[PDB]
Design goal:
This protein has about 300 residues and is mainly alpha-helical. The protein has 14 helices and no strands. The chain has one domain: 3'5'-cyclic nucleotide phosphodiesterase, catalytic domain (Catalytic domain of cyclic nucleotide phosphodiesterase 4b2b), CATH 1.10.1300. Helix content is about 65%, strand content about 0%. It starts with 6 loop residues before the first helix and ends with a helix. The protein binds ligand IAI, magnesium ion (MG) and zinc ion. It is classed as hydrolase/hydrolase inhibitor.
Length: about 300
Amino acid sequence: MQFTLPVRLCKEIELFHFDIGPFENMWPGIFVYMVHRSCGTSCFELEKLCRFIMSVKKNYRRVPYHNWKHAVTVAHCMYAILQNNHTLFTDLERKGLLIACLCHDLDHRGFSNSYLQKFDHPLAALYSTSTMEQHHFSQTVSILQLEGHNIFSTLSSSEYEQVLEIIRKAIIATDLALYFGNRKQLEEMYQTGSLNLNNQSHRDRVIGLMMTACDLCSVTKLWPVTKLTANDIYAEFWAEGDEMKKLGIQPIPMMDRDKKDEVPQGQLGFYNAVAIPCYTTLTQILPPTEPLLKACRDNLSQWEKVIRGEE
Ligand SMILES: Cn1ncc(C(=O)NCc2cocn2)c1C(=O)Nc1ccn2cc(-c3ccccc3)nc2n1
Ligand SMILES: [Mg+2]
Ligand SMILES: [Zn+2]
């Protein structure tokens, strides 16, 4: 019992810039298709996988950007990295990473770690750093322990502990505050030539950068997809900005809808300070991911065109 996709999706799903489409009822099948080719038809009991996916879906909320569509989109980018780097990854890693990507923003509310801390949200007392990401990992373990939801139950005890450790580090790594130092370290290790993928602490860092790259992959799509998704991410930013103003705090300009006019220039900074560096170091470490760097640079050039009034 293979999942099969229509011809256009069967071909395009293999490309980094694939968009999973507006038909929500096809996303679970798209995810299972990706597991079956990335991992095998044996990796998970279908009965259990199908029941884990629908529970994960139910625990994503109807926010403009940090939604179920984002979860599946970030898993597809991971699928494309793993398929283009066949022999670099263990079987456990292939299992753990697609599930980590699907779960990485579980129960997100559309608000940053900073807003939780200024609101004095209970989650900010339970987890002093990576507040939302520790919550996402907590929600992932909860769903795994629902009767009939243990997709890993047929792993050995220690293989089980290793896969939950991969998922945990992978989801904490999607805290962008940690990405800056993670990428500097990987930069120095690759340039001085000390990078060693048989060193666990090095693999961990490489997997963390892959998680940042999949997470940000909305900047790697065709320009029409990237530009329409930018509206979703700004609708969350500006809602958070409005909530900052209700706590009596001027938000950062990213979050102030009154400074919308300056979005193009704020996207440039973001591509230059975060996205380009991310995909460059990733392309240095895993050369076949170069199409993500090339699509990101194409989108930087479309924002330069917006600023020159040519759109
Ligand atoms: C975290 N994170 N994750 C994803 C994205 C994102 O912006 N991804 C880009 C994207 C997602 O989907 C389609 N495109 C970001 C991010 O911090 N962006 C940013 C970062 C800095 N800024 C500054 C401004 C801005 C806007 C208006 C006026 C003045 C300044 N604007 C920004 N925006
Ligand atoms: Mg997140
Ligand atoms: Zn995310």
